Amino acid sequence: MKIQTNAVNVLQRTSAYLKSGLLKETPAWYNVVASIPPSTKFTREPRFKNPSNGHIIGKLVDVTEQPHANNKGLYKTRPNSSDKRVGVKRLYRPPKLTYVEDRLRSLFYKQHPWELSRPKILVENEIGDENYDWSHMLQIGRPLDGESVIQRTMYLIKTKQYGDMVEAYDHARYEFYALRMQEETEQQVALEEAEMFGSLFGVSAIEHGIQKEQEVLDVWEKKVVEETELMAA
Amino acid sequence: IHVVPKLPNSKALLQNGVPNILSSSGFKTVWFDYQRYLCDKLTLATAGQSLESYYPFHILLKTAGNPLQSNIFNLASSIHNNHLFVENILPSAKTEPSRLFLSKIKDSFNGSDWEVVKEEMIYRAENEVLGQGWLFLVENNEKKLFILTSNNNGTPYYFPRNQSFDLNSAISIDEFATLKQMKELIGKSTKLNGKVQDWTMPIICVNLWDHAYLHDYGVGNRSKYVKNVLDNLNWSVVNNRIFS
Amino acid sequence: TLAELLGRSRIAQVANNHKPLTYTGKKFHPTHQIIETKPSTLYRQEWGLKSAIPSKIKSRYLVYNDLDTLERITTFEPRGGTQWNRLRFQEMGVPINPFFKKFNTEIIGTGGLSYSLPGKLKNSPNGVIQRTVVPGRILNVVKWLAAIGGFVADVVFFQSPPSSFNSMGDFIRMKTFLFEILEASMEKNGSVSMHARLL
Amino acid sequence: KIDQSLSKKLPKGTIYDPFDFSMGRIHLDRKYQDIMKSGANPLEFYARPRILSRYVTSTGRIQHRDITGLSAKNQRRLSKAIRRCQAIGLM
Amino acid sequence: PYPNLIPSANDKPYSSQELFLRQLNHSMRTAKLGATISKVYYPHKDIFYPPLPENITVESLMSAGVHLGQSTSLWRSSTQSYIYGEYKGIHIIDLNQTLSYLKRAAKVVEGVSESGGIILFLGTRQGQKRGLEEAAKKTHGYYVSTRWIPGTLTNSTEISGIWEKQEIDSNDNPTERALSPNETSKQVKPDLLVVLNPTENRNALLEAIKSRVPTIAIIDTDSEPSLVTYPIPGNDDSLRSVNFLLGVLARAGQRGLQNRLARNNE
Amino acid sequence: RLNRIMFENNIPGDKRSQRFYMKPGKVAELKRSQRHRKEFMMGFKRLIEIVKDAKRKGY
Amino acid sequence: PVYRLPPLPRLKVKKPIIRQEANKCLVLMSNLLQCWSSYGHMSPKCAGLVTELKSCTSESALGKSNINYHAARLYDRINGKPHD
Amino acid sequence: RRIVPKLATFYSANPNHEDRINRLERLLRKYIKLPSQAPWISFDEYALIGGGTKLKPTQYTQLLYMLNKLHNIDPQLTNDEITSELSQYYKKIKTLDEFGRSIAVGKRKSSTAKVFVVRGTGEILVNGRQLNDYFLKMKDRESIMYPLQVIESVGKYNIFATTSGGGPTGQAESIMHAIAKALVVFNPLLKSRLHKAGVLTRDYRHVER
Ligand SMILES: [Mg+2]
What we know:
This is part of a larger assembly, with 8 protein chains of 8 kinds.
Chain C: H1 2-8, H2 10-13, E1 35-36, H3 39-43, E2 61-66, E3 75-77, H4 82-92, E4 133-140, E5 144-148, E6 151-156, H5 163-168, E7 177-186, E8 192-198
Parallel strand pairs in C: 6-8
Antiparallel strand pairs in C: 1-2, 2-3, 4-5, 4-7, 5-6, 7-8
Chain G: H1 24-39, H2 47-56, H3 67-78
Helix pairs in contact in G: 1-2
Chain H: E1 2-5, H1 15-30, H2 43-49, H3 57-71, H4 80-87, E2 102-108, E3 111-119, E4 124-126, E5 129-130, H5 131-134, H6 138-150, E6 157-164, H7 168-186, H8 191-197
Parallel strand pairs in H: 4-6
Antiparallel strand pairs in H: 2-3, 3-6, 4-5
Helix pairs in contact in H: 1-3, 1-4, 6-7
Bound molecules: magnesium ion.
Protein name (chain C): Small ribosomal subunit protein bS1m
Family (chain C): Belongs to the bacterial ribosomal protein bS1 family.
Keywords (chain C): Mitochondrion, Phosphoprotein, Ribonucleoprotein, Ribosomal protein
């Protein structure tokens, strides 16, 4: 769509109306818009750095800055055909944001597919209210999930307590297991202790599933019988 | 996050505890540490879930019927109970029982006096609560006040989680028949969650947990502690808890 | 900066995946992260994704692939079923150790299905529970196959099937049985193989 | 007994939902129902009528790429191999 | 308090209505005992307790999901300068720019409300009525959420000419003066139009251009920025993000109105 | 079964098409037309599947 | 392969096919006639069918798709047309 | 001073309807917790106060839905606010005579009948004549007896029927209708059952060229 002119210049056209006398009374917005001008450039703006990983956008390494033989043993003595092509488009293409955590988020849930069955709430409470010390995994205001493992891993890396991401990730994994075993034992023992004092529950999870299966299976029986009778004819 | 509520006159509570019941280090154990401990555990058990948006009373009502969430229920119960108890022993926010409260005592406890019902409550707590629990004077939908003793973190609101019977030890056929009737009534509900209606509400709550009396009284002497509690209730709160 | 917060944001916490949302092969374990909403946010179609989910969705759970697509929709399914299987397993009590002391993609131990340790007894008002009883459904005439708590398990009989089996036939699944879950291991594919016995 | 189409066999070791016990599951299964789909060059099988008789019809008509699902290059190579096999007295 | 309720007799139990009032008494006093909830998002509070424009951070815009732009396959490249990057197949909106544009637009709303001008809140997506109504009511403004009749501005005589009009004083107090038919028939044009979903409201934007009304809009990755006087780059698809931005603008308008009443009471 | 074989090998269609001679340009344009119609039906079916999906989710 | 279409004047199915549920009466009648063909006329081996037939045809002897609406409603949204 | 549109919904299609719906929604939102347990104005009468020609049937149904929700709030817990807002939208028992008789009139075709039903022992006179004398067809007598047979009260009532006009069938069925109407008086709880029998419905059919 053509860059529109008549939405951002309402003040100028209104002032022409007022000066000519076509409009008698000044509108209520007139002085407000006069004191707060709209942005009227509507330009494409280049970018020179990827915000996420800090990679510089728009630098060409020269042959002088590659004085050493490449992996195939050949020196670089002249520019290649990629260096000679103007790369202005990269300056305007919105950069792809990248985080190592995402590679480490994919791994965790490949190693623990049943951690995907733990429901997650994506509704944020307030990102500014978070004050976490990742020296430990449990945090007040957070659940225990894969992100706890990964944030602890990143903490361990940035403090150089481990040099390799693999070892930090494994350490975080074992702390996560330590906490999960405690939680599951807490749940089981809480239920056991509740039953030992006369807690009378109604439908459990197993009975819930049984009743839903029954609801589905009744309709399935009816359809099967109807289809068999129809097929016979 | 669940946070411990701020109490009226917190400075005096930290300096001199509750007069006639608790010392400063007793009230610190029962409220400024136990309630903090419970709120931290509830936060860790409900953070990142729906329950984090609900008050402990609503949490315990929501999780009362789900067997696997019992731990959350326990926390949500104790927290709630621990503030029902503290609130009605705090010095202030000379209070006396209202005419309506004593009238309902005479209409419930066979026309008995309040002191006699207090002694009955002492006896009930002494016998039917081995170890940890809660003592309640509760009002049912029949306008009847009766004494309820829960073990550990049973709730006074929802009868299937009262936990008024210790099934670790032997029980009388009367208690077993009561459990059978309650199980049948639970099964009688049509709701898929399997919940029932229960309009019982607590009027008086006493914390029989070791966090309340152990430091100031000792391993025994919980009867003395309960007596001190019931002789020194905040009757403004207790009178407000009864529907007019 | 905004980039660091985005890397730490809740959408970023969900690992990228594009597995089909309508898989019709074999399901051994969850493939998609279950997304939950509170009742208050569901009332306002708010799920923490880019776009409001349609009001038709009354369930509080979904799985999704893409926040937005060329079709101007979010690719999602209003299903959170795999959590009820896991919890049902937790109700059974049968346990399944690599949870004790460059990257390996293989499932580690149980893939988060259960963290219960092997040797423990379930006290009950009767007494110590000797064996775990669970309702189930015999599936087909075959070790038979039974649908128990969201898992397909192998049924072994004491002596032989009863007359109800061949009386009903392919409608045997309509009636509920009681099973003892003997054991539960997990194989390399990530599938749990429970062995039970009819009672 | 009932027709096997109207029934659903839940495999062994697989998790399931109550939905799987329904006509919806069977219907969804119906709607959502090799050597050349690899680095192998089909032009090396021109002397192997058994292999490349799988990619023809009962009458011998080469199957369209919509059917075979091969890449364009491997479709072209497979067609060349089949035609060469037909010419050299095989096939 | 509760008229036409007949209590029960002490002999007989509580009735259903007595039980309701009893549990209400419980709810207001003891149901909230045990713990206070902190740092938890409540959807209604964006509407009734929106922050001031000066207190908005990038973090609170991000928690509302304002940064989540359209799919990269639906990009309108004229929005290139508003974009921070792409992540998970969608464009991310630069929230620093969103904050700057939002403060500018909020100041425009405040200035127009302080001048006694007419402010119109337009949003025609499903669950936007509550926020629009509350923004209008706290700015002494106007809103539409059902449908924008094309020609509502450029053909105001044929559409809005029949509805009633009213004379009001400096304090916005109805004077109850009798208007002439000629006065009633005149166009009453908004001084400011704010549209929450400008992509589905091109008619309103074009009418505002023709009728020369300054406009504010939430500009997503697929929306044309030049069609509005004061764009706000942000997510127009999420009710939380939309309500956050709308509540901010409504509070700015409320502050302008309060200042106007303050000086008119001095 | 035999008739399914016949249609699956386009034997009736080939026999009808071999009845009369068609100029190679007309053959080429008919071929282009038929291929376009097939691809149009494939795209139309994809769009209808998207419509059914969106309807089910509630869009 | 994905075959995207050009901008269409419409998105409409010419003759949408519907769920014609078969009449129970006709199925019962066919089963009864098959029974009489196999086991003889007025056979007692399927009197039940006769009864059922009599019960189902007693009062009455015989005992639309929405795809176009949703396709027209959603075409502009899903067609993937580039922005104006 | 300033001329501004009166309603906050002025720029909507039907501002009056939206304003009224907003007030009703506000009340239904303030008092959402109250439990629940109606001659509302007609569509035209609502059109006068709402959109007039702009008013749409779906809008009127929305109005009725809101008004019904508010009205169904438990009467004991309603307040002056709801009732005040709702009021804007709001739009001889028979007995026996001195002789214990229920008098009723029925019509069928061009026939009319006036019946005196008194408690008795199943006697009946028609125009002062025995039933079998006046009505020769048995099916006419069965028609006359049917309402008493519905309530199993043949043998509990004396009937003094008086007919005129039309022919035997018309007179017998007008007596049937009149008897049913008269019988309702002795026990109103049976009206429904009589209404279910079809004997309280006046047969409209008449000779039409
Ligand atoms: Mg958008």
